[PDB]
């Protein structure tokens, strides 16, 4: 690696809403505050609410009420 041409690569300390404090090296600067990480993200509960969407006879029979 060369000197003086590269940006500074100081290590930071990330933090998301789930308590996942995870130290990484980046070039952000001071600190970092996150929304979701690879843990607690809607990829495994997200497709759970994708399969059961379609269907019309069960729509109709709630307007049948019996």
């Amino acid at each position: 690696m060369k000197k003086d041409i590269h940006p500074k690569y100081e290590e930071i300390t990330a933090s998301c809403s789930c308590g996942n404090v995870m130290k990484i090296r980046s070039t952000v600067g001071h600190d970092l505050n996150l929304d979701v990480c690879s843990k607690c993200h809607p990829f495994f509960t997200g497709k759970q609410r994708d399969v059961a969407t379609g269907g019309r006879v069960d729509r109709f029979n709630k307007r049948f009420n019996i």
Binding site: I24, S26, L34, D35, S38, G46
Partner: peptide, 21 residues
């Protein structure tokens, strides 16, 4: 720096993608 990027890629940059599947 490709391991520390690939850490930084898949963990806290893929979840920041808007409307991700």
């Amino acid at each position: 720096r490709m391991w520390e990027f690939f850490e930084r890629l898949i963990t806290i940059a893929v979840p920041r993608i808007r409307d991700f599947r």
